[PDB]
Amino acid sequence: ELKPSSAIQRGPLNKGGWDAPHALHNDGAIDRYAHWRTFYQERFKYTRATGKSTLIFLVAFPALIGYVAYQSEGLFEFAGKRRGESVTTR
């Protein structure tokens, strides 16, 4: 006995416009390939290869750049120069 009112006359929704003809034949193999590649993260897992890449590019490589950047900080002063003069500071 609880129904939305008899005074609605609600209809269908169109988006409106022109049916453009198909300029592309979709390939099922390429479509499911790309749908597998974009949503790759929902099925990614940790293996030995994944862990090796994550150990290098997230941990070891920022640490190597950190060693190089914080050690060689105010060494070089190549502004003028001469012969026999100090090229570094430390």
């Binding site: 499911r32 597998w36 790759y40 099925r43 990614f44 897992k45 293996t47 030995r48 290869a49």
Partner: peptide, 26 residues
């Protein structure tokens, strides 16, 4: 599956058909 990177992607695919990779040139 021939190369070591093709082997390393076996546990990701769940519904993918897993075909043999062969060069398009050969």
């Amino acid at each position: 599956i021939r190369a070591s990177f093709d082997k390393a992607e076996e546990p990701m695919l769940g519904d993918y058909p897993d075909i043999d990779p062969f060069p398009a040139q050969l």
